Design a protein around this nucleic acid. Structure first.
Length: 51
DNA sequence: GGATTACACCCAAGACACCAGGCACGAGACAGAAAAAAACAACGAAAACGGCCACCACCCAAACACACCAAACACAAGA
């Protein structure tokens, strides 16, 4: 399995680690339940792709 | 073919080259070019055979004449 690179992950998508959590664990992970995702985190900065 | 398309002000966010073939030096091989020799042209010397004048005799050319034929004024005919 040659490592060919790292692909940034869209938050609240099927590959995010915040997809399987419930509201309780979300609270423990410092995540706002109102936050809907849809953006990326690059160097700690939230980025959104404009259509 | 270029060149220009409002004015002022505020804030945030990322990068501030990395990596790959050419110059120098680093050494071989046919080609860019140089040296030589052997079959290429000619000329000097000897050999004898082809070329020139005689001698020569038979075959073609000219003269004589034959009969034969082509031809040209004109007496006659003719429209």
């Amino acid at each position: 399995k040659v490592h060919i690179g790292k692909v940034p992950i869209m938050l609240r998508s099927k590959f995010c680690s915040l997809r399987t959590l419930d509201e309780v664990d979300l609270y423990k992970m410092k995540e706002c339940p109102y936050d809907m995702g849809g953006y990326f985190v690059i160097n700690g900065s939230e980025k959104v792709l404009i259509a």
